[PDB]
mmCIF file of C-alpha atoms and ligand atoms in Angstrom:
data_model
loop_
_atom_site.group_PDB
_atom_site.id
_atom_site.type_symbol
_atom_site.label_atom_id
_atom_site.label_comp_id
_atom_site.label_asym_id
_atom_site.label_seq_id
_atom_site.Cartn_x
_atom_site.Cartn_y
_atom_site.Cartn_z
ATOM 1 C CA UNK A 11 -55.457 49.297 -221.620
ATOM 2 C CA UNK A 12 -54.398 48.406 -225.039
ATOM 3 C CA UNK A 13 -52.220 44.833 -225.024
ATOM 4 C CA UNK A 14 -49.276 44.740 -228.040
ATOM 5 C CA UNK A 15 -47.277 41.478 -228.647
ATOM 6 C CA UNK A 16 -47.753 40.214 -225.266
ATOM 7 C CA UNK A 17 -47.418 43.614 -223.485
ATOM 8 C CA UNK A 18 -49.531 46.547 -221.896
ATOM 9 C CA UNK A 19 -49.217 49.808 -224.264
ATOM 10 C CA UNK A 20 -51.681 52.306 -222.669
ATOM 11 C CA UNK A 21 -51.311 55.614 -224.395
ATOM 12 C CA UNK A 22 -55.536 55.738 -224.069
ATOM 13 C CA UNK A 23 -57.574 57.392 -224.974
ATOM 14 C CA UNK A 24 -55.533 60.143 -226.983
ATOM 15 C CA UNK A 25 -53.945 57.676 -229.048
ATOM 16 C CA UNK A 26 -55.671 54.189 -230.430
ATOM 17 C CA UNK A 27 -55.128 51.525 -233.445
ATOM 18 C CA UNK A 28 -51.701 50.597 -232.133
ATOM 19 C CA UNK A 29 -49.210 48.500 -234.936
ATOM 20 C CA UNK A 30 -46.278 47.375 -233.760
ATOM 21 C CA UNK A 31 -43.128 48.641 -235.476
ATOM 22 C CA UNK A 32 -40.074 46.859 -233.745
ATOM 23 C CA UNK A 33 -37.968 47.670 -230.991
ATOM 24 C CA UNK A 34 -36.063 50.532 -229.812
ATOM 25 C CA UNK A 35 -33.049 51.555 -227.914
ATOM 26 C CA UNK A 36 -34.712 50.268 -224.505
ATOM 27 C CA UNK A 37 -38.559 49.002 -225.017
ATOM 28 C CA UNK A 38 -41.127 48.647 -227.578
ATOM 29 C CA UNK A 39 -42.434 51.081 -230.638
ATOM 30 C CA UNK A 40 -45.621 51.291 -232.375
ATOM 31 C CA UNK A 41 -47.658 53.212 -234.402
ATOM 32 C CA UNK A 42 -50.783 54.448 -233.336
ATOM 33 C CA UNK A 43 -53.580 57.199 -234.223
ATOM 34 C CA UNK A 44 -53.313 60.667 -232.494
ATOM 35 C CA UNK A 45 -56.973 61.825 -231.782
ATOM 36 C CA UNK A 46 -56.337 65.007 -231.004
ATOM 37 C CA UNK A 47 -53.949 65.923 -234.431
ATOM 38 C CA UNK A 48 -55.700 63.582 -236.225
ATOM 39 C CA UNK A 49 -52.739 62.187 -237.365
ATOM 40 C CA UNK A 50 -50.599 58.521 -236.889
ATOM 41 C CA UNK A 51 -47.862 59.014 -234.331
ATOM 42 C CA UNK A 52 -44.534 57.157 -233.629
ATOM 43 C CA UNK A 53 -44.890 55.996 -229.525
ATOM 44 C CA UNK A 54 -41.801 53.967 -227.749
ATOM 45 C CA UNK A 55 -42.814 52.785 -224.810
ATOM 46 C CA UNK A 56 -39.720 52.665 -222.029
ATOM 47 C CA UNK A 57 -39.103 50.932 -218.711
ATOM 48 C CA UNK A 58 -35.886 52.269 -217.442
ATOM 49 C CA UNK A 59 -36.427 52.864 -213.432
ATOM 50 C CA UNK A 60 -34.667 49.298 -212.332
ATOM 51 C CA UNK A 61 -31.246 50.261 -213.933
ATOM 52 C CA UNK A 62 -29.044 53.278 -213.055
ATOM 53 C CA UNK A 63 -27.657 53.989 -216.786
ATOM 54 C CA UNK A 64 -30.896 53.455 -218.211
ATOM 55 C CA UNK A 65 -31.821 56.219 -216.134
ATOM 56 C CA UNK A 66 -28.980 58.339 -217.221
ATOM 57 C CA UNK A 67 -29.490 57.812 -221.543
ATOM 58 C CA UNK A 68 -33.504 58.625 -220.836
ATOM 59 C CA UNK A 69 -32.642 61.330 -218.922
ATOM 60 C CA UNK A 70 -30.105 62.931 -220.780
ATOM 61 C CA UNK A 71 -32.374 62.387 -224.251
ATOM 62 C CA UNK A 72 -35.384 63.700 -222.722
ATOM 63 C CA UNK A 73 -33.508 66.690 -221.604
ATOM 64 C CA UNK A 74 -31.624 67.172 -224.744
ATOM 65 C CA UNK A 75 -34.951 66.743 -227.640
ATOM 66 C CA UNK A 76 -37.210 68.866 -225.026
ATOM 67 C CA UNK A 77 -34.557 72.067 -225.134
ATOM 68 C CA UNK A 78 -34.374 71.575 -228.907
ATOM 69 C CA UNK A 79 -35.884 72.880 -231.881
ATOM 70 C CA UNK A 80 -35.057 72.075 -235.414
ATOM 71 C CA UNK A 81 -36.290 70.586 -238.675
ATOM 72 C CA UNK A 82 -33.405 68.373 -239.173
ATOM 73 C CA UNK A 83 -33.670 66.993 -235.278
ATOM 74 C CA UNK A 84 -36.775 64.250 -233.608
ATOM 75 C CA UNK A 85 -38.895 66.667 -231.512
ATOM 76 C CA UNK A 86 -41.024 64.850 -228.403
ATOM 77 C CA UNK A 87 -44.626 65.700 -229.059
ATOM 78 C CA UNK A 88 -46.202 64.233 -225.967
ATOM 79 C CA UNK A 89 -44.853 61.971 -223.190
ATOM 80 C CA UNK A 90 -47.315 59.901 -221.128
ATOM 81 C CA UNK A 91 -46.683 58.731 -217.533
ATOM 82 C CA UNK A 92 -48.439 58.043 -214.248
ATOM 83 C CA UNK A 93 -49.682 61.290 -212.397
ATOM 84 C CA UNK A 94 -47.209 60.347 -209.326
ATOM 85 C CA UNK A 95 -44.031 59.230 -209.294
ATOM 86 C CA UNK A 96 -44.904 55.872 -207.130
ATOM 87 C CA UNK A 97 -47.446 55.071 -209.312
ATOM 88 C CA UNK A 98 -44.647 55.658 -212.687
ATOM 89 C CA UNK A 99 -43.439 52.543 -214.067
ATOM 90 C CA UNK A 100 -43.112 53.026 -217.600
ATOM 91 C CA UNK A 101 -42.715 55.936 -219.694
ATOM 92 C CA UNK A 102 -44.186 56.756 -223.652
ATOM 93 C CA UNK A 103 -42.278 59.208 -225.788
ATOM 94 C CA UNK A 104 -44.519 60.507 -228.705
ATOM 95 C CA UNK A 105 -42.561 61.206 -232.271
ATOM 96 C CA UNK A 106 -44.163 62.423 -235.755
ATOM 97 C CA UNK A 107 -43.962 59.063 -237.778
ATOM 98 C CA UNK A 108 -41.593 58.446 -239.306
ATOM 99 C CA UNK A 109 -41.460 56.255 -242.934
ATOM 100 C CA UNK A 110 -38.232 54.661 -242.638
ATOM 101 C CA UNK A 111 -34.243 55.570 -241.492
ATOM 102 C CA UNK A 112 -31.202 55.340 -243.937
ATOM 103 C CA UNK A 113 -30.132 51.560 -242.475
ATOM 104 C CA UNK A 114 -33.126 50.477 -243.706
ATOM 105 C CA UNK A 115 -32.931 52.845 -246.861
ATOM 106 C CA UNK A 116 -29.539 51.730 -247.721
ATOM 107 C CA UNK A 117 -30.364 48.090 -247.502
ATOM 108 C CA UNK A 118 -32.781 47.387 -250.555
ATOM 109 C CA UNK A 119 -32.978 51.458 -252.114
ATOM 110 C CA UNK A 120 -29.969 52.616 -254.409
ATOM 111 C CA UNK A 121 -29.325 56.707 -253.690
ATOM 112 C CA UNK A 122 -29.230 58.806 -256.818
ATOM 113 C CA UNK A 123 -26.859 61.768 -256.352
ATOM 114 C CA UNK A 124 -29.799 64.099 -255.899
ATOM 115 C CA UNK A 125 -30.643 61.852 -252.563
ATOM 116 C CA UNK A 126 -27.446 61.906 -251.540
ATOM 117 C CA UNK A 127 -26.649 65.782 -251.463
ATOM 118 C CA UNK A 128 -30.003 66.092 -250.262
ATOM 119 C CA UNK A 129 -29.473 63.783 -246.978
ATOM 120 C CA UNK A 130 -25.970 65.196 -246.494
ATOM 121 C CA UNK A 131 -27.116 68.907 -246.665
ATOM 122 C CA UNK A 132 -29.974 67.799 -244.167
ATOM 123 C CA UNK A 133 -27.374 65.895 -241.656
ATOM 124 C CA UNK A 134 -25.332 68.644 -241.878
ATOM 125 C CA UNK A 135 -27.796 71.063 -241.214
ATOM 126 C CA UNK A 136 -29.093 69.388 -238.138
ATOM 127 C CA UNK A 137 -25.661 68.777 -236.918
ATOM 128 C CA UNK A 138 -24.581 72.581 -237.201
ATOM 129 C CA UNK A 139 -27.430 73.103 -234.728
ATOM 130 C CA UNK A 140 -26.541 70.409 -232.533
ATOM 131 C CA UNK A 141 -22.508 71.573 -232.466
ATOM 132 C CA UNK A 142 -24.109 75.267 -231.770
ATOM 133 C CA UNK A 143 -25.467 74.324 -228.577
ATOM 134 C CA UNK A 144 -21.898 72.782 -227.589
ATOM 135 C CA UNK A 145 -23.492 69.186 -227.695
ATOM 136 C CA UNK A 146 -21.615 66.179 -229.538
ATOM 137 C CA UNK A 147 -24.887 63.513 -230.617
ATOM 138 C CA UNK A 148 -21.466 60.685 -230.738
ATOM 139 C CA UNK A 149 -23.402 57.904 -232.411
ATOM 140 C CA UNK A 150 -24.053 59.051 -235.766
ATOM 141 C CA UNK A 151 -25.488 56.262 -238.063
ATOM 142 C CA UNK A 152 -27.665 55.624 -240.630
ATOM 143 C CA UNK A 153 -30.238 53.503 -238.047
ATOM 144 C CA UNK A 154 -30.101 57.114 -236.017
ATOM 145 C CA UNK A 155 -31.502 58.866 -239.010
ATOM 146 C CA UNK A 156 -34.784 58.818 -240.022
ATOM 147 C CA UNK A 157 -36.737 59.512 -243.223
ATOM 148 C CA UNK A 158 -40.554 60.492 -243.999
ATOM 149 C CA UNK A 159 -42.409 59.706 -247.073
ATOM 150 C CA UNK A 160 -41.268 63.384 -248.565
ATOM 151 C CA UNK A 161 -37.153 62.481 -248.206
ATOM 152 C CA UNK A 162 -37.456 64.749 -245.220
ATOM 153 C CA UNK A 163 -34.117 63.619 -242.264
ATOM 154 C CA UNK A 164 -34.359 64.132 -239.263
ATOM 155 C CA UNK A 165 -31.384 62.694 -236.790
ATOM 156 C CA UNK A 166 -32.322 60.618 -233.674
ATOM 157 C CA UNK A 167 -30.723 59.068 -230.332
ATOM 158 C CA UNK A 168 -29.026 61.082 -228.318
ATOM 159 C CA UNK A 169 -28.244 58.383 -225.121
ATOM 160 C CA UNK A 170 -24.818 58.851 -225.815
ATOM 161 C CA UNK A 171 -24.633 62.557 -226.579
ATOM 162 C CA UNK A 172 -22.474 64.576 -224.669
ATOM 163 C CA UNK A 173 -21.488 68.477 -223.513
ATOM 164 C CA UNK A 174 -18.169 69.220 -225.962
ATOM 165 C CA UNK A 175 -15.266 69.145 -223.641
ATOM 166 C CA UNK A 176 -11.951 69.223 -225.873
ATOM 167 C CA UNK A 177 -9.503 70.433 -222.672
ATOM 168 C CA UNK A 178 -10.324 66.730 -221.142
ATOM 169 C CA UNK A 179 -10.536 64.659 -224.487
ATOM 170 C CA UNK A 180 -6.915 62.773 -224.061
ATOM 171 C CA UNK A 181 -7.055 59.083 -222.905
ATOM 172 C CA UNK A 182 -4.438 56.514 -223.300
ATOM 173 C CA UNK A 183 -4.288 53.862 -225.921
ATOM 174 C CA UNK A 184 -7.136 51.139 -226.095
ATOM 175 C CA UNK A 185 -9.389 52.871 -224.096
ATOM 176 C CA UNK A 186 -12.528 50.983 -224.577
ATOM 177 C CA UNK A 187 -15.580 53.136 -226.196
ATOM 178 C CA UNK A 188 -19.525 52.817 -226.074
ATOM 179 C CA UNK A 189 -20.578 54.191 -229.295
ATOM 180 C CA UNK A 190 -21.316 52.108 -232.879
ATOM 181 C CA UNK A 191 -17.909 50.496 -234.167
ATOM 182 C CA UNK A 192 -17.913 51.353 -238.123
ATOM 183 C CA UNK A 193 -18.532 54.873 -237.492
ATOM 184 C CA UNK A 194 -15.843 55.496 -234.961
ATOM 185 C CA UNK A 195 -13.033 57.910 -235.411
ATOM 186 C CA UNK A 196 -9.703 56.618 -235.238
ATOM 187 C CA UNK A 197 -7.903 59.079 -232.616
ATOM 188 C CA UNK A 198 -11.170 56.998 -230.223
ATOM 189 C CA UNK A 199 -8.938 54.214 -230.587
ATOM 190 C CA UNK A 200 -5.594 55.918 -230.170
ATOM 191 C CA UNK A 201 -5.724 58.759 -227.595
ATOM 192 C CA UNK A 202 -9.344 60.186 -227.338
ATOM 193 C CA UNK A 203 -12.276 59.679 -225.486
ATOM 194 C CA UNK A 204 -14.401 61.465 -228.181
ATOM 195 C CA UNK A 205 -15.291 64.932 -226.182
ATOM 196 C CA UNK A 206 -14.667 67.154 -229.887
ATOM 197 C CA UNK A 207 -16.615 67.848 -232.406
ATOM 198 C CA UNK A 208 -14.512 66.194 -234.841
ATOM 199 C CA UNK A 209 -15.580 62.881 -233.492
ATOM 200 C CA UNK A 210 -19.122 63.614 -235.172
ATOM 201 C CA UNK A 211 -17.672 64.743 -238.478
ATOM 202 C CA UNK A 212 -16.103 61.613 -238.889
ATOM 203 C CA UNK A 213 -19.208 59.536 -238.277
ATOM 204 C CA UNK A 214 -21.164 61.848 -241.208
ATOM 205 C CA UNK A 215 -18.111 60.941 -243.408
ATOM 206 C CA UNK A 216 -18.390 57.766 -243.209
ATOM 207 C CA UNK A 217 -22.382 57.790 -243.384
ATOM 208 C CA UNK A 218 -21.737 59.588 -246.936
ATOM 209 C CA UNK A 219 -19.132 56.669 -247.892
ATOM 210 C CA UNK A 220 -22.207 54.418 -246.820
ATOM 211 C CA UNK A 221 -24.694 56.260 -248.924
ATOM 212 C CA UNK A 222 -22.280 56.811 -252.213
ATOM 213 C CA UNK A 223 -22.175 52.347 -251.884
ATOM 214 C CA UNK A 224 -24.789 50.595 -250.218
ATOM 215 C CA UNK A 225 -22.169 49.321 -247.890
ATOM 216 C CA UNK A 226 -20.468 50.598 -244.687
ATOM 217 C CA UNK A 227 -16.702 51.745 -245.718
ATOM 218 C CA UNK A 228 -15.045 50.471 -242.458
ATOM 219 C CA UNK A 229 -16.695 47.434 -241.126
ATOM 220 C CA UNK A 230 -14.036 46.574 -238.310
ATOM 221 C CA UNK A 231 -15.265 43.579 -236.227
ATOM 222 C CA UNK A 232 -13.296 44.757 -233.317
ATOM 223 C CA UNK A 233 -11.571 47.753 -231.536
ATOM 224 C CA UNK A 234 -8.102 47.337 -233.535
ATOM 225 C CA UNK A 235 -9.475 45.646 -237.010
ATOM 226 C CA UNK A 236 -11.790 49.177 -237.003
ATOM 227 C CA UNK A 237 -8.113 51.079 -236.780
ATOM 228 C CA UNK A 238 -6.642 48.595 -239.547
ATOM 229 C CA UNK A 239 -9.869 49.165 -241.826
ATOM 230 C CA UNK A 240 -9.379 52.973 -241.897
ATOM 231 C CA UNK A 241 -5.687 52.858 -242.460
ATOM 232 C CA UNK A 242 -5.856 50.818 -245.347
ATOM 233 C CA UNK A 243 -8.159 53.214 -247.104
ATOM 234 C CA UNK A 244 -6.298 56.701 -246.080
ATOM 235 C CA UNK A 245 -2.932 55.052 -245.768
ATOM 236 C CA UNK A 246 -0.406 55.377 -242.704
ATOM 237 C CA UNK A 247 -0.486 58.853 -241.381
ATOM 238 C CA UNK A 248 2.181 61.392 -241.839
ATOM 239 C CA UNK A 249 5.061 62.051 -239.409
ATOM 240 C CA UNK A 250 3.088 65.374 -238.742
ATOM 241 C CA UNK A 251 -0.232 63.625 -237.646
ATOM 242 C CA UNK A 252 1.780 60.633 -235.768
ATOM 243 C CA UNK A 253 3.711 63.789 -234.088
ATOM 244 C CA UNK A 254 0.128 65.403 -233.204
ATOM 245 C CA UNK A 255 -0.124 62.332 -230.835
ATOM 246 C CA UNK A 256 1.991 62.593 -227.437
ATOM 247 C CA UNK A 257 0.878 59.015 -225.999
ATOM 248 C CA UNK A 258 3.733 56.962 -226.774
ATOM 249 C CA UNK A 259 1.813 53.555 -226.725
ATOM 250 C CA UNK A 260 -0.963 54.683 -229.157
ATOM 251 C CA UNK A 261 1.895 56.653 -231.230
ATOM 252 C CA UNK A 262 4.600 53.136 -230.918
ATOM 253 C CA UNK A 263 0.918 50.725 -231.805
ATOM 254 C CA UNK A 264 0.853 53.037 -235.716
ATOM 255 C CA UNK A 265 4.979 53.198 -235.821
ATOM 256 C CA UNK A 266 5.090 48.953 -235.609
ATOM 257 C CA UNK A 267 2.732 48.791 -238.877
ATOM 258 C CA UNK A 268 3.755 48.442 -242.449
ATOM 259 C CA UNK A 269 3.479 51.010 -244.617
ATOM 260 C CA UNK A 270 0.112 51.663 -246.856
ATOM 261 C CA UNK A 271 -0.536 53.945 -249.134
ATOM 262 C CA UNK A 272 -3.621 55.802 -249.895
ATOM 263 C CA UNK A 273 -6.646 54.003 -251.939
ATOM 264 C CA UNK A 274 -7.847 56.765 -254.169
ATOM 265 C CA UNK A 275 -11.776 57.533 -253.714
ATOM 266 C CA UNK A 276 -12.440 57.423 -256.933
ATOM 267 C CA UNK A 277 -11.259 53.873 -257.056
ATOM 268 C CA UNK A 278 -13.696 53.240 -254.298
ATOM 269 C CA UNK A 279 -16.351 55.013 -255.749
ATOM 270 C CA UNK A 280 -16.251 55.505 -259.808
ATOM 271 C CA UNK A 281 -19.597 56.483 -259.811
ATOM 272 C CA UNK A 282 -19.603 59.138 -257.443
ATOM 273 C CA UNK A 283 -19.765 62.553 -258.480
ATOM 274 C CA UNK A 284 -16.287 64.215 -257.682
ATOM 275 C CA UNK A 285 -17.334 67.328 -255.509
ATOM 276 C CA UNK A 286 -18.840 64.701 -253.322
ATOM 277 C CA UNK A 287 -15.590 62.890 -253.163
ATOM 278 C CA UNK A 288 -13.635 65.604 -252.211
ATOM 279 C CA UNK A 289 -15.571 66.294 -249.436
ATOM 280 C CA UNK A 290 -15.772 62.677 -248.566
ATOM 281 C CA UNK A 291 -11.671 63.177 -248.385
ATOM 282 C CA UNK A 292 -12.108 65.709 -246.175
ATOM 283 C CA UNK A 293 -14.427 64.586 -243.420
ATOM 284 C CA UNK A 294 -11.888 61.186 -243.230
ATOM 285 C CA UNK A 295 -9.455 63.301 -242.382
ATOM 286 C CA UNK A 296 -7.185 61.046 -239.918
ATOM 287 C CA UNK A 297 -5.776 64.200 -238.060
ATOM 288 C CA UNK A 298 -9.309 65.611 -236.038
ATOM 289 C CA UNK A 299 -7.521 69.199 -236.074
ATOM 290 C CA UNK A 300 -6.828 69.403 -239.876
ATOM 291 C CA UNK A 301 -10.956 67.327 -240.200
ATOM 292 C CA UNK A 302 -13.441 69.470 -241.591
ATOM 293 C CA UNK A 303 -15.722 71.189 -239.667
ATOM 294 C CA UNK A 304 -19.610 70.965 -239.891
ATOM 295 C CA UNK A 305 -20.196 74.764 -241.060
ATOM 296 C CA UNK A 306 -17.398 74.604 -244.076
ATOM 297 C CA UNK A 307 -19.025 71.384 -245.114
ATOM 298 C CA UNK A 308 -22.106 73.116 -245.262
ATOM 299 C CA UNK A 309 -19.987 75.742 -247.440
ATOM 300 C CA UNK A 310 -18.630 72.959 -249.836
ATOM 301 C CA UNK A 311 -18.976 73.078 -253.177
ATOM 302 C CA UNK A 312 -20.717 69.298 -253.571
ATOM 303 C CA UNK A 313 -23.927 71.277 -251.172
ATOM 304 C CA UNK A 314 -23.972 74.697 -253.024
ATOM 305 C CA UNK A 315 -27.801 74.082 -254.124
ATOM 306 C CA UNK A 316 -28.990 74.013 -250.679
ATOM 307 C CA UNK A 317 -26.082 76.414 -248.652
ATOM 308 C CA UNK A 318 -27.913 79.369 -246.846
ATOM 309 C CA UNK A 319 -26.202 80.037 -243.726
ATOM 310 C CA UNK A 320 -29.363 82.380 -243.023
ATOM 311 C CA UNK A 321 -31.543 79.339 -243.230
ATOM 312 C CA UNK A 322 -29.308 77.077 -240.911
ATOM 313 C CA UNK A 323 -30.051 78.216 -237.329
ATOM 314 C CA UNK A 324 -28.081 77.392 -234.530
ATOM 315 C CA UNK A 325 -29.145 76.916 -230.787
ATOM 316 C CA UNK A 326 -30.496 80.310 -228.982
ATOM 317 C CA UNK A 327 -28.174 79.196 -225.668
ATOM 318 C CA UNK A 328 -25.002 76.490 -225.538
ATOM 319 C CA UNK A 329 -26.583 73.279 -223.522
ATOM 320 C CA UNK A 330 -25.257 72.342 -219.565
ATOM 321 C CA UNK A 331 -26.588 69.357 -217.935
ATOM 322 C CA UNK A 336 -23.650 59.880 -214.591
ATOM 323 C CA UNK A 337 -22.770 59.749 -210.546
ATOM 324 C CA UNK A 338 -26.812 59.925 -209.588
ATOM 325 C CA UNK A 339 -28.707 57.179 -207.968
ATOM 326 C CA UNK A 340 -31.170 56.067 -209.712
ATOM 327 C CA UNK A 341 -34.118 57.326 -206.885
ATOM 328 C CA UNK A 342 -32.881 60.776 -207.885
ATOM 329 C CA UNK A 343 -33.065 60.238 -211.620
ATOM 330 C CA UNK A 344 -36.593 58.644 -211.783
ATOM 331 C CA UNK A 345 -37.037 61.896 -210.117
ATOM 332 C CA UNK A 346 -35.736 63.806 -212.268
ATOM 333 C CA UNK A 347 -37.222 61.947 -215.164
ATOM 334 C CA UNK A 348 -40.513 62.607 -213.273
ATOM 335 C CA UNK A 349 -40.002 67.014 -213.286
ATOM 336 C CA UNK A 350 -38.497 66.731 -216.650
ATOM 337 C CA UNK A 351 -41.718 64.988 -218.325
ATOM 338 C CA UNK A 352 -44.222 67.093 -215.884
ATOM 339 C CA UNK A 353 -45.599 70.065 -218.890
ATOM 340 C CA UNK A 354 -46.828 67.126 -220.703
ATOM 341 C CA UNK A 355 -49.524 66.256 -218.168
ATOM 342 C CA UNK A 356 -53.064 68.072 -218.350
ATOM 343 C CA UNK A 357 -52.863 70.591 -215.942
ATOM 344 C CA UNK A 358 -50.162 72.738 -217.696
HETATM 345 F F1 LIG B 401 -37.071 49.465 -236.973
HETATM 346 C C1 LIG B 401 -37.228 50.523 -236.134
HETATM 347 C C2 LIG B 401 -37.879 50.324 -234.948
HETATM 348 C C3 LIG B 401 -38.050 51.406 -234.105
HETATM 349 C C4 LIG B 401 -37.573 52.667 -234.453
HETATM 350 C C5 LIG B 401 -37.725 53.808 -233.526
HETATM 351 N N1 LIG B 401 -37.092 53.757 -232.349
HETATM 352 N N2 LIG B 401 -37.449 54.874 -231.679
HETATM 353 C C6 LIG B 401 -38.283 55.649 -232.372
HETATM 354 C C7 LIG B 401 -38.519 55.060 -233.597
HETATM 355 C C8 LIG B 401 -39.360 55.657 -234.669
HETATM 356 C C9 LIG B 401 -39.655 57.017 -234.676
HETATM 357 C C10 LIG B 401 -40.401 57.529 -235.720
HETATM 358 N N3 LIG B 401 -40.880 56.786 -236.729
HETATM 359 C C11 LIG B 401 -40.600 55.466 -236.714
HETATM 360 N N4 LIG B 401 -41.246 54.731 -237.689
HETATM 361 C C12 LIG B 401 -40.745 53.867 -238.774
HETATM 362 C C13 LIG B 401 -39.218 53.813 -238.837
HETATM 363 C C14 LIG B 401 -38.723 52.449 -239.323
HETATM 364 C C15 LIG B 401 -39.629 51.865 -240.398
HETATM 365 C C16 LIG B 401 -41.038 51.630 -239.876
HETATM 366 C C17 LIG B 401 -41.334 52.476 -238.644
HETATM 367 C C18 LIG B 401 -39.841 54.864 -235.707
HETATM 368 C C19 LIG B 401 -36.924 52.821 -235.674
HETATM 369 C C20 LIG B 401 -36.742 51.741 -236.522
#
């Protein structure tokens, strides 16, 4: 067995000439050399059979990336694991390779317009499909998408995605969130506990805010500074989107602040080409019901070179899937990764 950085990475004999590349959500990633494809391969090794939620984001990602199928989306091309679930201690997920992902990008690499459209069209297009299957990914950000040599995106990371359940979204005010800060809607920190779609079209918005600057637009450092960010951008909301919100605490937290009005986009971003802007306007939509959704963004005007519904599939079934112990979900984890072993 190959040893990496101090650790055992057997993913023998299939793949060899292991590099490491960093680390991942939960364990170790390297690169390494696919014998049969004759190809280099991204492999994360993962050791989540101790810990209960570990169980649960594994889980629900395996399931997720194994049911679907699309450009714009991280397939699994191989997992590796012992042949019996006693002897199963560790887990490898096998990835094409990837060249970078837009954090990365958007740290040292300015984005001509042509980039930008490009990434948003692709983001978009992987999201419609996503959305189709009633799944929300929920943690949208550029370290979640990933780039290959050719500009080709395809989104990653869905521990935190979810089954869209709008009838149950309402929560009280302050109710505490697990998903990245800066790309956080702000009904998460008023009344919602981010079971809409909406939630997602926020997060793209303010990935294309990210990508029209080099910077992120709404760096909050904590729950209520994120709030305070986005209102002094879009202003305070209008009686009509305060009156969309019933919880008197969240609705008494916006009344107590001073007034601010609106910082034009264009004053935030003078080089930005204007159809891109109004978009922009329209995915930071503060009310989530009047927000754009992901198939009229497609439509927009600022996409129009790539648009072609016909070419934009959507899911073949909506997707149904934690209170599981964690013997049951190692289980599970076990039958879920089974038609990658050789006799299947
Ligand atoms: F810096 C990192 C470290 C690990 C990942 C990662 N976590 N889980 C899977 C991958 C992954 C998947 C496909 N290709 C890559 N390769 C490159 C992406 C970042 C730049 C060099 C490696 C990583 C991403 C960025």
């Amino acid at each position: 067995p190959e040893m990496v950085r101090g650790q055992v990475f057997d993913v023998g004999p299939r793949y060899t000439n292991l590099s490491y590349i960093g680390e991942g959500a939960y364990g170790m990633v390297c690169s390494a050399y696919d014998n049969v494809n004759k190809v280099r391969v991204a492999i994360k090794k993962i050791s989540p059979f101790e810990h209960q939620t570990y169980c649960q984001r594994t889980l629900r990602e395996i399931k997720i990336l194994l049911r679907f199928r699309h450009e714009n989306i991280i397939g699994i091309n191989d997992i590796i694991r012992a042949p019996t679930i006693e002897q199963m201690k560790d887990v490898y997920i096998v990835q094409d390779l990837m060249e970078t992902d837009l954090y990365k990008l958007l740290k040292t690499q300015h984005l001509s317009n042509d980039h930008i459209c490009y990434f948003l069209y692709q983001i978009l297009r992987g999201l419609k499909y996503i959305h189709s299957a009633n799944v929300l990914h929920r943690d949208l950000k550029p370290s979640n998408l990933l780039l290959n040599t050719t500009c080709d995106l395809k989104i990653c990371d869905f521990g935190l995605a979810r089954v869209a359940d709008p009838d149950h979204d309402h929560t009280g005010f302050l109710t505490e969130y697990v998903a990245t800060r800066w790309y956080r809607a702000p009904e998460i920190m008023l009344n919602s506990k981010g079971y809409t779609k909406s939630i997602d079209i926020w997060s793209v918005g303010c990935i294309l805010a990210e990508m029209l600057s080099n910077r992120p637009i709404f760096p909050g450092k904590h729950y209520l500074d994120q709030l305070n960010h986005i209102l002094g951008i879009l202003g305070s909301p209008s009686q009509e989107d305060l009156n969309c919100i019933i919880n008197l605490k969240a609705r008494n937290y916006l009344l107590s602040l001073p007034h601010k009005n609106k910082v034009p986009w264009n004053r935030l971003f003078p080089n930005a080409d204007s159809k891109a802007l109004d978009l922009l306007d329209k995915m930071l939509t503060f009310n989530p019901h009047k927000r754009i959704e992901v198939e009229q963004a497609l439509a927009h005007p600022y996409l129009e070179q790539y648009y072609d519904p016909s070419d934009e599939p959507i899911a073949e079934a909506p997707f149904k899937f934690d209170d599981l112990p964690k013997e049951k979900l190692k289980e599970l984890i076990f039958e879920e990764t089974a038609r990658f072993q050789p006799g299947y």
